[PDB]
Amino acid sequence: GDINKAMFAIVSFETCKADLLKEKDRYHNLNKIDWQSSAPVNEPDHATTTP
Amino acid sequence: FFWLKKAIITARKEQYFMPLASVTNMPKHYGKTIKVYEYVPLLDDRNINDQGIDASGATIVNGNLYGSSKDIGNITSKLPLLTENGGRVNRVGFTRIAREGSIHKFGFFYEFTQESIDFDSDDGLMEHLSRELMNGATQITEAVLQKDLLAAAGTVLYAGAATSDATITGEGSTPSVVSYKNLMRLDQILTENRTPTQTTIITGSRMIDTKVIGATRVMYVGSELVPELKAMKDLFGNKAFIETQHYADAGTIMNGEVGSIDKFRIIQVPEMLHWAGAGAQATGANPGYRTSMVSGQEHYDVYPMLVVGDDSFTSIGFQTDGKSLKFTVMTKMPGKETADRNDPYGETGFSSIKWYYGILVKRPERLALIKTVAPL
Amino acid sequence: EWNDLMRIEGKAKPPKVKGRSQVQPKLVRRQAEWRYSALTEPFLGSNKLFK
């Protein structure tokens, strides 16, 4: 019943490569993910108003 | 009676072959095919060309100096030698080969009704239905990948004295069970084909009763073959199988590992697929090997045992965001949207899932396989 | 379920019959409608937000 005693919390958000590249040093392994693609966001677990 | 308000659920089935596959990006507006070149070396037999002149100035059939032949007489016969006033004597030729792969489509869907949505005592039914739909999709895709890999093997070693699948039998003088010599031969073949290793040798620890193991390749087996592997004895008659607790120290235990034999670290895969009825007919003299009924006759069951190499194959990715596979889910809840033109009641709905899958085999010599029977 | 009760969807929807009505007044929406603007206003009174 207390948020302060929680061991972990997991949050899912939508981001673009510009946001991640705004701080280069923070993120590693940025490669190995395709960007030259065009796919619906989908992700049934994620709930959003984006069509 | 009082319903518990909680359900009993079974989780997914963990997948082993899908994580290995590497992904090759394929843009759209091209087609359903991907291709690469392959440049063969100078001296291999595959270098069939028509650009050859021997040391005597005369034309010759083969343009490669000497093939993949280790014979000393042949090498001495076909060496390139040059006299002092040399000119226009030795010529060589080159060749390249192409390989391809294609993308296929998949999908399935289900239907439900609005009265079932509402009047049902259990709340949250559609969440459960979505969960089983997704689990089924993942399991099917993994099975398809494993099936294609088993079908596309390049190195095949039948156990015992068999020659084809129909000949693999467990009855008679020489049953077709895996042996220590078969594993040694498989290692020899992979070493000759220059297949890179995966793991490294495990030296000892300082703690009492800890054996030393030097396996260097990873091998996938079914659940049925594990007792047969445990009962194996090496050349001198001692035990062969070494369980994981002996070398868990001074090493890292991989996921789903049962032990190490010879130079392979066995891994048990729950969803391993086996052929049914491939073997020869089984009479009443069965020593206790698994069989199956095909057309009223009991035939033996031929089982896998697979060693996937490195860079052997890649998975084509079509709009998958650089992943092996991505699903697309749609749902339409009942209402006016599903009020049919010939039925404005709108009591039904649906949910559908689909994907694109295809595989490119860059080098099929690295894939290796053993066919055996599995004890009951 | 609470959102369906508020917006009248899912189980809260009235049954459909050809010869009869399908009108449901929205009690929950009404009660929430005054409470929203009752609670919102104090945070917007002054030019400054934090003291």
Resolution, Å (one decimal):
4.0
Q: Which residue shows structure tokens 């998975």?
A: B315
Three-state SS for B200? coil
Which contiguous run of DSSP H or E holds residue B356? Answer: strand B348-361
Give the residue from B356, B329, B361 showing the smallest Cα distance to B26: B356
Q: Please report how many Cα atoms fall inside a 13 Å half-sphere around the Cα of residue B191, on the Cβ side.
A: 9
* List of chain C residues whose C-beta atoms are within 8 Å of the C-beta of residue B345: 16
- Of B301, B296, B351, B318, give the one whose Cα is nearest residue B113: B351
Q: Which residue has the tokens 């020899």?
A: B188
Collapsing DSSP states into helix, strand and coil, what is residue A5?
Answer: helix
Q: Is any Cβ of chain B less than 8 angstroms from the Cβ of C48?
A: no
Token pair recorded at residue B121: 């005592």
Sign of torsion over alpha carbons B80, B86, B89, B90: positive
DSSP B272-326: ----SS-S-B--TT--SB-EEEETTEEEE--B--EE--SSSEEEEESSSSSSS--
Of A36, A39, A40, the CB nearest to B27: A36
Beta partners for residue B24, in sequence order: B316
Give the Cα separation of A32 and B366 in Å (integer): 24
Q: What is the DSSP letter of C11?
A: G
Task: Please check whether residue B177 is in contact with residue B160, taking contact to mean a CB–CB distance below 8 angstroms.
Answer: yes
> How far from the centroid of its chain's Cα atoms is residue B58's Cα?
49
Angstroms from B116 CA to nearest CA on chain A: 23
Reference B220, options B249, B263, B257; nearest CA is B257
Q: Are B298 and B288 in contact (CB under 8 A)?
A: no
Alpha-carbon distance of A29 to B267, in angstroms, equals 29
**Which residue carries 């060589």 as its tokens?**
B92
Chain B CB within 8 Å of residue C41 CB: no
Considering only CA atoms, which of B315, B286, B317, B319 is closest in space to residue B300?
B286
Contact yes or no for A44 and B322 at CB 8 A: no
Cα B307 to the center of its chain, rounded Å: 7
Chains touching chain B through at least 3 C-beta pairs below 8 angstroms are A, C
Residue B33, sorted as left (phi over 0), alpha (psi -120 to 50) or beta, turns out to be beta
Q: Answer yes or no: are the C-beta atoms of B272 and B280 closer than 8 Å.
A: no
- B332, two tokens: 């339409």
Contact C16 B118 (CB under 8 A): no
How many CB atoms within 10 Å of residue B227?
Answer: 11
Distance from CA of B351 to the nearest CA of C (A): 17
DSSP-based three-state secondary structure for B341: coil
B118: chain C residues, CB-CB within 8 Å: 10-11
Q: Which one of B118, B345, B346 has the shortest CB-CB distance to C11? A: B118
Q: Are B47 and B94 in contact (CB under 8 A)?
A: yes
Q: Which amino acid is at B322?
A: G
What is the rounded distance in angstroms from the CA atom of residue A7 to the CA atom of residue B104?
44
The overall longest dimension of chain C from CA atoms, in Å, is: 61
| Phi, psi angles (nearest 5°) of residue B246 | -65, -40
User: CA-CA distance, B301 to B224, in Å (whole number)?
Assistant: 11
User: Would you call B111 an interface residue with chain A, using a CB distance cutoff of 8 Å?
Assistant: no
Find where tokens 């705004």 sit.
A22
State how far the Cα of B39 lies from the Cα of B163, in Å rounded to an integer: 33
State whether B123 and C1 contact (CB < 8 Å): yes
Name the method of structure determination.
cryo-EM
Q: Is the dihedral of CA B245, B247, B251, B257 positive or negative?
A: negative
Question: Which region holds residue B152: left if phi is over 0, alpha if psi is between -120 and 50, else beta?
Answer: alpha
B328 touches chain A (CB under 8 A): yes
Enumerate neighbours of C (3 or more CB pairs within 8 A). Answer: B
Taking a contact as any Cβ pair under 8 Å apart, which residues of chain B between 116 and 135 contact chain C?
117-118, 123
Q: How far is the C-alpha of A19 from the C-alpha of A17, rounded, in Å? A: 5
Transcribe B128-196 into DSSP letters.
HHHHHHHHHHHHHHHHHHHHHHHHT-SEEEESTT--SGGG--SSSSS-----HHHHHHHHHHHHHTTPP
Q: What is the dihedral of CA B333, B339, B345, B348, to 10 degrees?
A: -40
